[PDB]
Structures are given as structure tokens and as C-alpha cells.
Amino acid sequence: DGTMTQEDISDYVAANMKDAISRTSGVGDVQLFGSQYAMRIWMNPNEL
Amino acid sequence: RYNGLPSMEILGQAAPGKSTGEAMELMEQLASKLPTGVGYDWTGMSYQ
């Protein structure tokens, strides 16, 4: 429905799916093809 | 917390004559009428 971007999808999977899948019966390692959201502080050296 | 998600453990039992299976089957139907984003699960004796 084009309401979620690549980054939005990766966050939801990492935040609501990965942990439970990684603890599911017979599952070894789980590799996320993306990254969970973090609070990004993008600094400006001119303003600093 | 239960399986990594916030939870609230609820104990209870079947009424005189009625079985555990019947009690659990009703709780499942009561749980399906709860607000959006609220799931359920069985633990301990109920898991077995």
C-alpha cells in the first residue's frame, strides 16, 4: 500500500519479528537484511 | 514480559463439572474480542 519505506520495513522486522524467530524451534543464527531504527543525531560542523 | 514482549499472567480454572479444554476454548474466544494489538498465549500447565 506504499505507506512504509525500505527503512520502515527493516525496523518493524527487527523490532517485532527477529527476536521471536531467533528463539523459534530449530533456528540457529538469524541475519537481518537491513537495520533496526536508532535515534540518529546527524551533526552539522558549521552550526557546532 | 513473556517471550520478549510485555505481558500480564492471568490464573484461573474450569467451574465444577466443566473441563479445562472448555474453559481454555472460551478464554480464546474472549481474547479474540479484545482491542487491536493485544494477543494471548498458554504457559506452564496450559502449554503441556
Swiss-Prot record, chain B:
Induction: Positively regulated by MarA, Rob and SoxS transcriptional regulators (at protein level). It comes from the Bacteria. It is found in: Cell inner membrane. Disruption phenotype: Loss of susceptibility to contact-dependent growth inhibition (CDI); inhibiting cells still contact the target. AcrA-AcrB-AcrZ-TolC is a drug efflux protein complex with broad substrate specificity that uses the proton motive force to export substrates. Belongs to the resistance-nodulation-cell division (RND) (TC 2.A.6) family. Homotrimer, with large domains that extend into the periplasm, interacts with AcrA and TolC. AcrA may be required to stably link this protein and TolC. Interacts with AcrZ. Part of the AcrA-AcrB-AcrZ-TolC efflux pump. This is Multidrug efflux pump subunit AcrB. It comes from Escherichia coli (strain K12). The lineage of its organism: Bacteria, Pseudomonadati, Pseudomonadota, Gammaproteobacteria, Enterobacterales. The gene is acrB.
